[PDB]
Write a protein that binds this ligand. Structure first.
Ligand SMILES: [Zn+2]
Ligand SMILES: [Zn+2]
Ligand SMILES: [Zn+2]
Length: 178
């Protein structure tokens, strides 16, 4: 197994996947690494299993059909994996904890949002459809773009949004377009 956490790239108390060489800190893995379970399979392995069992799950989909799906166990897992993929980028640190807004010439968003809040929400089964999760995720970047205006710091939102959107298209097999 790897000797660093797959998400944050640090050593520490690591839990090792039994079906692939990845390791994780407890609360870096999403969901949090399970108390017992021998063998244990990580979220990457579980998502690979879904694909293997239903190879047609990788044919193209329309985003609008994906958003309306109910959060059954497989969609739940997919949103967990998408969320983990954003945390894997170091630039996620800017969006993880609860923000605050006090900048001359700007006003705070009406609805603040952050990754840790989406993580709690997923854990507490508060999203009934994929749409709920995806809306909160995009809301994080949108709020950032709006607040930081022409400051070059706006680019961080564009960057992490791009990671989110590429992973969304991949995980939910969105039909490729030009
Ligand atoms: Zn970690
Ligand atoms: Zn694994
Ligand atoms: Zn099938």
């Amino acid at each position: 197994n790897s000797n660093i956490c797959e998400v944050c790239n640090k050593w520490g108390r690591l839990f090792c996947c039994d079906t692939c060489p990845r390791s994780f800190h407890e609360h870096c893995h999403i969901p949090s690494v399970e108390a017992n379970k021998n063998p244990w399979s990580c979220i990457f392995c579980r998502i690979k299993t879904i694909q293997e069992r239903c190879p047609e799950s990788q044919s193209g989909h329309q985003e609008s059909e994906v958003l309306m799906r109910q959060m059954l166990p497989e969609e739940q897992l997919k949103c967990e994996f998408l969320l983990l993929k954003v945390y894997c980028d170091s630039k996620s640190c800017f969006f993880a904890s609860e923000p605050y807004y006090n900048r001359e010439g700007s006003q705070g968003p009406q609805k603040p949002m952050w990754l840790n809040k989406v993580k709690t929400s997923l854990n507490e089964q508060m999203y009934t459809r994929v749409e709920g999760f995806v809306q909160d995720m995009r809301l994080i970047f949108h709020n950032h773009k709006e607040f930081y205006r022409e400051d070059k710091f706006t680019r961080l939102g564009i960057q992490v949004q791009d990671i989110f959107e590429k992973n969304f298209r991949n995980i939910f097999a969105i039909q490729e377009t030009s």
